[PDB]
Design a protein around this ligand. Structure first.
Ligand SMILES: CCCCCCCCCCC(CCCCCCCCCC)(CO[C@@H]1O[C@H](CO)[C@@H](O[C@H]2O[C@H](CO)[C@@H](O)[C@H](O)[C@H]2O)[C@H](O)[C@H]1O)CO[C@@H]1O[C@H](CO)[C@@H](O[C@H]2O[C@H](CO)[C@@H](O)[C@H](O)[C@H]2O)[C@H](O)[C@H]1O
Ligand SMILES: CCCCCCCCCCC(CCCCCCCCCC)(CO[C@@H]1O[C@H](CO)[C@@H](O[C@H]2O[C@H](CO)[C@@H](O)[C@H](O)[C@H]2O)[C@H](O)[C@H]1O)CO[C@@H]1O[C@H](CO)[C@@H](O[C@H]2O[C@H](CO)[C@@H](O)[C@H](O)[C@H]2O)[C@H](O)[C@H]1O
Ligand SMILES: CCCCCCCC/C=C\CCCCCCCC(=O)O[C@H](COC(=O)CCCCCCCCCCCCCCC)COP(=O)([O-])OCC[N+](C)(C)C
Ligand SMILES: CCCCCCCC/C=C\CCCCCCCC(=O)O[C@H](COC(=O)CCCCCCCCCCCCCCC)COP(=O)([O-])OCC[N+](C)(C)C
Ligand SMILES: CC(C)CCC[C@@H](C)[C@H]1CC[C@H]2[C@@H]3CC=C4C[C@@H](O)CC[C@]4(C)[C@H]3CC[C@]12C
Ligand SMILES: CC(C)CCC[C@@H](C)[C@H]1CC[C@H]2[C@@H]3CC=C4C[C@@H](O)CC[C@]4(C)[C@H]3CC[C@]12C
Ligand SMILES: CC(C)CCC[C@@H](C)[C@H]1CC[C@H]2[C@@H]3CC=C4C[C@@H](O)CC[C@]4(C)[C@H]3CC[C@]12C
Ligand SMILES: CC(C)CCC[C@@H](C)[C@H]1CC[C@H]2[C@@H]3CC=C4C[C@@H](O)CC[C@]4(C)[C@H]3CC[C@]12C
Ligand SMILES: CC(C)CCC[C@@H](C)[C@H]1CC[C@H]2[C@@H]3CC=C4C[C@@H](O)CC[C@]4(C)[C@H]3CC[C@]12C
Ligand SMILES: CC(C)CCC[C@@H](C)[C@H]1CC[C@H]2[C@@H]3CC=C4C[C@@H](O)CC[C@]4(C)[C@H]3CC[C@]12C
Ligand SMILES: CC(C)CCC[C@@H](C)[C@H]1CC[C@H]2[C@@H]3CC=C4C[C@@H](O)CC[C@]4(C)[C@H]3CC[C@]12C
Ligand SMILES: CC(C)CCC[C@@H](C)[C@H]1CC[C@H]2[C@@H]3CC=C4C[C@@H](O)CC[C@]4(C)[C@H]3CC[C@]12C
Ligand SMILES: CC(C)CCC[C@@H](C)[C@H]1CC[C@H]2[C@@H]3CC=C4C[C@@H](O)CC[C@]4(C)[C@H]3CC[C@]12C
Ligand SMILES: CC(C)CCC[C@@H](C)[C@H]1CC[C@H]2[C@@H]3CC=C4C[C@@H](O)CC[C@]4(C)[C@H]3CC[C@]12C
Ligand SMILES: CC(C)CCC[C@@H](C)[C@H]1CC[C@H]2[C@@H]3CC=C4C[C@@H](O)CC[C@]4(C)[C@H]3CC[C@]12C
Ligand SMILES: CC(C)CCC[C@@H](C)[C@H]1CC[C@H]2[C@@H]3CC=C4C[C@@H](O)CC[C@]4(C)[C@H]3CC[C@]12C
Lengths: 613, 613
């Protein structure tokens, strides 16, 4: 077959260089970008049906996720209404449904509970004033999140979601599922548990819940358990029996309607002392400027909430964009969601993002442009102004059970954890660390710790690389580790070391140790012994994988070269990239008799050059 | 001259694998490790003189650095005495002098001031009780630092000091010099400034100092200014006139003795209301168990103090070990200094490490084994029990001026900052970020921020690598970027991309973008266009610099290969390391018709194989 034949001079870097010479309508994305390009002829019907369906779903979803936040039921309607309208303008994706997404809602509610506890606020009981303070805190947090997202989009840093690795995303998702399960379990049991804010909070809440389980409201518990059973049964049947009925069954909406029907008919609120929403505001409240003085106590939480919400939004947007063959602007997504959160925070809402289930409902029933979003917002509006009284008898345990039923996919990742461990240990370590940190910490603090641990794992993987002592395959130019192939011959008096990493400070000490181990000695000690009195003659450093190089790395390389030259041992560098050589020359490496003549193109020119002497 | 001639088959990874088959008396370092091997015949005199000199220096240094900590003068004597005795046993280095090192002392004092403010403690004035509380807090912090150091040495993690990069070390050193200058400027002026704890504290202290400069004690200011002038003048003369008098002149000790002499003779304390130490305990106080309940409020500070103190200790130890041709055990250094800090915290001392100036004094005057340390400790002991009364009239402004005079070398690094910028921008960025963070934050918080900023810079450098579209140098096997050499020919219908970095999540998005830019299109869009209807035929990925690879990287590579195969474009990998191929095979890459036959040894076997078809 084909043969590898090449005849050329032995090029050093100096010789190679001698012979071959070197050397305005986007930030505010218009609705006019697609409204003139609309398809009113046929798209109107699909948009209307899709919007009605996703609005029916999203009213219930926002109502339920308002419990995840520490705000009274009714402000979830505002959170499902306002951001959709103000994302219809600046939004790039045309399939996602803007809403609470209970993970972000639970982060917001954790912040609100921390900044407005039951005992710290009410000393009389002042439900109304406490709810007002909680709403103000949620609005302030939403405004801060929107400001942060707008700043990030303006700075065009949309790649920060790359740092949200799949393992840490999965671990954070499982931990958030556990936290949401604990919160909604507190809600369904109708048990009055004091809120624990800080570290180990979830386990303290579980301890108090299992201590107060004797005070469980039987009616609420049965309602929640039946809602969960019905929802998961219908979801499993849809997953199995999927060839027919392509549109997923909106079981949650029907379950809520029926449960509200019985709650009104038999009046569980008075007869069985059930925990119902009991209050829904009618009409739209006037906008109120949040107190910016609280921004200092929300920074570490607003940052994490913004990052998580934007990551979820872009994830769903990309999932549907690759399906419908279009591209979403990440920085414009940041702009759209930052403006959305600012607008919603001004109008008394908590942080808004997209939800995979709501987006799936919107798309599967005739998914088209964001006009479906406007229709869903209109449905939420008529729910706010008209259907508010009808939803009063509905129990909160039903909403909490709906969220718990939806938690299955989030809980499912512990099954793929062991496969992650079998494939790559560090990825499973990142997963488990993110899960544990987000459990025994805040979800915001857990996310920050998971990101930080991902950075640390990258640094450690770069800092402790694979290094080999290379030898030549006979009659070829192929050099492999001598201990791996058993047909590898060690060259005469010359050791070849491959350090498969960029050289920085941690790598500097690692590389010094690796060279000392490979050559079998250290230049300092032998030089000192020879001075007091008064096996290897060449060391080739295979630097093909040396990506970057810092001042500490250049200083270490110079020190190694000088130390080995002091004992009449020549150090040669091979396979160094052009940019690394530029870094060496601009870091002052080529001073004091270096002259770039000890640099070769591959580790075969070095060996041939040594054989020439 | 020598020529590059090689004849061999074109080996893919599959073909290459087919043809070439693969496959108890240290933790407590005894004084008996060198005491039987001692040289009593001649080493005793050198050790005695060196110990006397360094003890005279270290008594004054500990006395001065006790002001850097928020503890009364006199406990610096204990901090200079006890750790030396308990490091004589477990210590590896035989040249360093154990003591306060005013940077660690200032970190301890910042912690102590934060945890025992003037207004929060005294509400009557209760100098005695406040001093007792400050001493207890310093002892608790020292015990926690010792526990952390002992744990780190037991875990054998002595490489954490590699993460203390030279740029961040220099920036932290300059910021610590600024903080120490501010503190000792507050002391010398004898101005009562309320202590600011937290962020922006140094600038608040400067503002208050310049506001209260009208209340400056003239006698203390003149004493401090004269002490500074004399110390720097003598140091400059020694640096210039250095051929004679090899032993550095101990100007600080003589200056302190003379200043105390005039303070006793003229009684500056009563006549001019000078700020004197005014109190030195006689004898040794009984040991007291620190309250461990304060450990929770010292963790972020104790960790940083332990890391900084250990880093300084090992830095000085290595500097003198490479000079005297011996090796110091890093983990045993951790053990020794952790036991030292535990012992000193039990005996009412603040955190102990080594000082470059004190170690230089000890070594230059007959530096020998740690017996000189024992002699210095004995000198400090006789200062504690006898010379305590003689040092009472000495002003604190003299000690603060001594520290300020020593701050010159620490302040000098702003001179090398611009050269760091010219050599490597990211290293200067690390330097400046560490300096600014340690200025507007705590020194401990500044150190943590600088460390993780170094981690972030490493992650970013790996995440945004140098990538090139390679082409062949004629009649050779040398492939270089087509836009850099101008003699490079693009091969027929095949693009070669070199991604000079390990492939992880941020890198997988970067690599997808790089491939899309290089090939001039994207597989997804062209495949979708062809499906709706119903330039490059090969892409070689030069993966020589791909160091590691995670599950996200393997998934991205599989997706790229599948997407390009969908549009009849073949993707080949070349120069991949053996361990990266093992990672690919254990991550499930070689499934669904991959078969490892698209992997070549270098980027010339791929081109020859393509030319074969
Ligand atoms: C883009 C990159 C990432 C950016 C991340 C930004 C993080 C910003 C943190 C901000 C911060 C540190 C600043 C320095 C940080 C140094 C870090 C060094 C790291 C080195 C590796 C500000 O610190 C000070 O905090 C004071 C309050 O303590 C605050 O208020 C004071 O002045 C007010 C008038 O101004 C006055 O009204 C007020 O009365 C005063 O008290 C001050 O204004 C503020 O300066 C800490 O505050 C954050 O908020 C909370 C505070 O309690 C705290 O909440 C947690 O509570 C749960 C437990 O209960 C916990 O479980 C939750 O998680 C979380 O809800 C957060 O944890 C904390 O973080
Ligand atoms: C190896 C790698 C590094 C390890 C670093 C380890 C750091 C550990 C920090 C410990 C920590 C957070 C724990 C969670 C951190 C999560 C981080 C996630 C990061 C994700 C990327 C504990 O948090 C809680 O703090 C409570 C006090 O607030 C403390 O006391 C409570 O219960 C007691 C009875 O138990 C009871 O007696 C007490 O009355 C209660 O109040 C609790 O016990 C304790 O759990 C925060 O505490 C640390 O100490 C100080 C507190 O004020 C604070 O001091 C700063 O003040 C200056 C301004 O004034 C500032 O300028 C200085 O710098 C610094 O002196 C520190 O800043 C803070 O850090
Ligand atoms: C801190 C450590 C950060 C890196 C950890 C992952 C890494 O690179 O090593 C991993 C080791 O991981 C393990 O052997 C698993 C146990 C490690 C537990 C660490 C807990 C940290 C708290 C590397 O895994 P490997 O290179 O496959 O070996
Ligand atoms: C956060 C950024 C972390 C990495 C920064 C260094 C890096 O790799 O880029 C540096 C850019 O650095 C600059 O151009 C200087 C200005 C950057 C200021 C950053 C402030 C952060 C707060 C990289 O420098 P370069 O690759 O030589 O270009
Ligand atoms: C579609 C589903 C979710 C509708 C749920 C309707 C709720 C309100 C219904 C369904 C089952 C009902 C329970 C069935 C049995 C009992 C026991 C009886 O001694 C008291 C009433 C009580 C406790 C009922 C309360 C109301 C209840 C919980
Ligand atoms: C009992 C209630 C009140 C609290 C616990 C939450 C309940 C409703 C939910 C939360 C997550 C759920 C689990 C999620 C995943 C699976 C795997 C599946 O193959 C069998 C069902 C099973 C095992 C579910 C059982 C029911 C479950 C445990
Ligand atoms: C509310 C509290 C109780 C939640 C606690 C969740 C913790 C304990 C759970 C959540 C996910 C779990 C992990 C999921 C999968 C695996 C792989 C298998 O080899 C068992 C261990 C391990 C690694 C589990 C360890 C325990 C774990 C980290
Ligand atoms: C070790 C390999 C063979 C396990 C293969 C099956 C995996 C996917 C299953 C089998 C049993 C499962 C565990 C069973 C029980 C628990 C406790 C709870 O905290 C959830 C996670 C955890 C820890 C599960 C994690 C996933 C698990 C380990
Ligand atoms: C096809 C293979 C992977 C199936 C393996 C069984 C799976 C479905 C089962 C085995 C054990 C189960 C876990 C057991 C315990 C808990 C704790 C609960 O609070 C949430 C559900 C969770 C986390 C379960 C999730 C589903 C689970 C992981
Ligand atoms: C990868 C890196 C950045 C992760 C860093 C996580 C560190 C800072 C976190 C993770 C878990 C945290 C601990 C969790 C619980 C407690 C108990 C509390 O009474 C004192 C604080 C203490 C002891 C915390 C100290 C800080 C801590 C150790
Ligand atoms: C070797 C050096 C450091 C010795 C320092 C000795 C100190 C105590 C001496 C040296 C110079 C002296 C000052 C010289 C001049 C004056 C002005 C006079 O109107 C009041 C006394 C006062 C303010 C003296 C106070 C004491 C003083 C500050
Ligand atoms: C005036 C006093 C009270 C407060 C300021 C500190 C004084 C004593 C010290 C601290 C650092 C010192 C500087 C450090 C470095 C240099 C560079 C040298 O080539 C000339 C002297 C000079 C410029 C020093 C002058 C004196 C100095 C500014
Ligand atoms: C107590 C307060 C005032 C201390 C403030 C210290 C800050 C402002 C100082 C300390 C060291 C300084 C840096 C040292 C060297 C250089 C290089 C030159 O190109 C000037 C800018 C730059 C980058 C300086 C910027 C300002 C700087 C960061
Ligand atoms: C820019 C190049 C040419 C400068 C070369 C000389 C360098 C070493 C010197 C010249 C002037 C110096 C600056 C002069 C003044 C200040 C203000 C103060 O905060 C100290 C740092 C800083 C910012 C100095 C940093 C170092 C500096 C920039
Ligand atoms: C040989 C070359 C590098 C000499 C350049 C001049 C050097 C010695 C001078 C120029 C400007 C000076 C700085 C000017 C201002 C300050 C602020 C002060 O609070 C500490 C000293 C410090 C930081 C000085 C240190 C010395 C300095 C950097
Ligand atoms: C590389 C990474 C780890 C560095 C992280 C540094 C971050 C967390 C630090 C650096 C400087 C800090 C800020 C410094 C000053 C203030 C003003 C205060 O009123 C509120 C907190 C706030 C706004 C801090 C927030 C946190 C902050 C932005």
């Amino acid at each position: 077959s084909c043969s590898y034949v090449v005849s050329r001079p032995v090029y050093s870097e100096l010789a190679f260089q001698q012979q071959y010479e070197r050397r305005v309508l986007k930030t505010l994305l218009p609705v006019l970008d697609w409204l003139p390009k609309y398809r009113i002829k046929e798209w109107l019907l699909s948009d209307i049906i899709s919007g009605v369906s996703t609005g029916l779903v999203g009213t219930l979803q926002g109502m339920a996720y308002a419990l995840l936040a520490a705000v009274p039921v009714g402000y979830g309607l505002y959170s499902a209404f306002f951001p959709i309208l103000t994302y219809f303008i600046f939004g790039t994706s045309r399939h996602i449904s803007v809403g609470p997404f209970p993970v972000v809602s639970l982060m917001v509610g954790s912040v609100v509970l921390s900044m407005a506890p039951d005992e710290h606020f009410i000393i009389s009981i002042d439900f109304a004033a406490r709810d007002a303070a909680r709403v103000l805190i949620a609005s302030t947090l939403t405004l801060l999140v929107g400001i942060i997202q707008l700043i990030f989009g303006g700075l065009q840093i949309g790649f920060i979601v790359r740092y949200l690795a799949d393992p840490l995303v999965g671990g954070f998702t499982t931990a958030a599922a556990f936290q949401v399960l604990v919160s909604q379990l507190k809600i369904v049991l109708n048990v009055s548990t004091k809120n624990y804010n800080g570290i180990l909070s979830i386990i303290y809440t579980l301890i108090e819940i299992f201590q107060n389980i004797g005070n469980t409201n039987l009616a609420d518990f049965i309602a929640g358990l039946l809602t969960i059973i019905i929802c998961m049964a219908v979801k499993e049947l849809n997953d199995r029996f999927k060839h027919k009925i392509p549109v997923p069954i909106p079981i949650e909406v029907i379950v809520t309607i029926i449960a509200t029907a019985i709650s009104y008919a038999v009046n569980l609120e008075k007869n069985y002392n059930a925990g119902i929403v009991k209050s829904i505001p009618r009409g739209f409240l006037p906008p109120e400027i949040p107190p910016i003085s609280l921004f200092s106590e929300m920074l570490t939480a607003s940052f994490s909430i913004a990052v998580v919400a934007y990551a979820i939004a872009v994830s769903v947007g990309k999932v549907y964009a690759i399906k419908y063959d279009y591209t979403i602007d990440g920085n414009q997504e940041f702009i759209a969601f930052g403006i959305s959160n600012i607008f919603s925070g001004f109008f008394s809402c908590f942080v808004a993002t997209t939800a995979l289930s709501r987006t799936a409902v919107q798309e599967s029933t005739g998914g088209k442009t964001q006009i479906a979003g406007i229709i869903s917002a209109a449905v939420v509006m008529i729910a706010i102004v008209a259907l508010g009284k009808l939803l009063e008898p509905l129990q909160k345990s039903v909403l909490a059970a709906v969220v718990i039923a939806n938690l299955k996919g989030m809980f499912m990742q512990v099954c793929d954890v062991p496969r992650l461990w079998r494939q790559n240990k560090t990825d499973a370590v990142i997963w488990v660390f993110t899960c544990i940190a987000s459990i025994i910490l805040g979800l915001d603090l857990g996310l920050l710790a998971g990101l930080m641990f991902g950075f640390l794992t990258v640094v450690v993987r770069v800092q402790f690389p694979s290094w080999n002592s290379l030898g030549s395959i006979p009659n070829t130019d192929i050099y492999r580790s001598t201990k791996d192939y058993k047909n590898i011959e060690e060259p005469e008096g010359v050791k070849i070391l491959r350090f498969s990493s960029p050289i920085f400070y941690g790598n500097v000490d690692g590389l010094k140790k690796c060279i000392k181990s490979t050559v079998g000695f250290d230049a300092i000690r032998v030089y000192n012994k020879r001075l007091k009195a008064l096996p290897i003659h060449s060391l080739v450093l295979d630097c093909g994988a040396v990506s970057f190089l810092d001042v500490v790395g250049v200083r270490s390389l110079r020190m190694i070269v000088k130390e080995f030259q002091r004992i009449d041992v020549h150090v040669y560098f091979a396979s160094l990239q052009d940019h690394v050589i530029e870094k060496l020359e601009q870091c002052g490496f080529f001073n004091d008799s270096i002259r770039k003549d000890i640099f070769f193109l591959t580790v075969h020119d070095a060996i041939l050059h040594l054989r020439s002497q």
